[PDB]
Amino acid sequence: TPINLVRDLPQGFSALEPLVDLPIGINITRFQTLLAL
Amino acid sequence: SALGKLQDVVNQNAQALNTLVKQLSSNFGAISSVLNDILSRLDPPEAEV
Amino acid sequence: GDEVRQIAPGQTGKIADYNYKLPDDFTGCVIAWNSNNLDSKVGGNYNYL
Amino acid sequence: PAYTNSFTRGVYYPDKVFRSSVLHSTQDLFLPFFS
Amino acid sequence: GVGYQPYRVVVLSFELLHAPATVCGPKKSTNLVKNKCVNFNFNGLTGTG
Amino acid sequence: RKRISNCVADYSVLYNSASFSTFKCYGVSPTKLNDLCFTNVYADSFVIR
């Protein structure tokens, strides 16, 4: 999205296009994230 | 709001038609609600059921 | 054997497809009985094309 | 754990199907409003 | 016995979803007609219009 | 559990071949397989007696 903020998520609508349907064939119970360090 | 009675008749009829069309998307226990899908997937013996 | 049970109303099979298809309105009865002592010749009978 | 409200975020297309000028409900895994 | 011998089983799971069709059968594609009533069969949504 | 990516799935030689004891299918029919266009196929294989 082309946002321009001061802080925090904005107020307003924004959709989410489907990017890919990954064929994992696994189960998922715990997740994490990754960052730039 | 003066012509409520006339509008109500229109609203009631349009609402009834909408539900009738929306019922075409129900399964009723069938594998699919699209008649073509059943025909194009199953042989007549199992399509009739 | 099982081909005996392969013939029936609304049944898909190799017998049904090409050899002996029963209609899906079959108002009759299928009488089958083992015939090892009648037509079963030793070594395999080559009259069952 | 710091917290905040998500006003109207995390709205996606539950189905890949297109359609226009329709207000239709969709039972799907979404992010609650103001969550 | 027949009821106790190695029986290899492969179960093929499908799904009739509006998601794009990736696996399909060997059917030749025809030309695109328009402005005319025809029986359209693109991937699975066989129909007339 | 092996799945199938984009392909042209020729189910034609899966029942027209005397190499399968049972070809029971639910929600789909053998002769109609070749005309379908699936979003994906899962090929799950296990062994029973």
Ligand SMILES: *[C@@H]1O[C@H](CO)[C@@H](O)[C@H](O)[C@H]1NC(C)=O
């Ligand atoms: C996923 O599978 C692993 C392997 O046994 C198991 O430990 C875990 O509890 C499973 N998670 C769920 C949600 O079933």
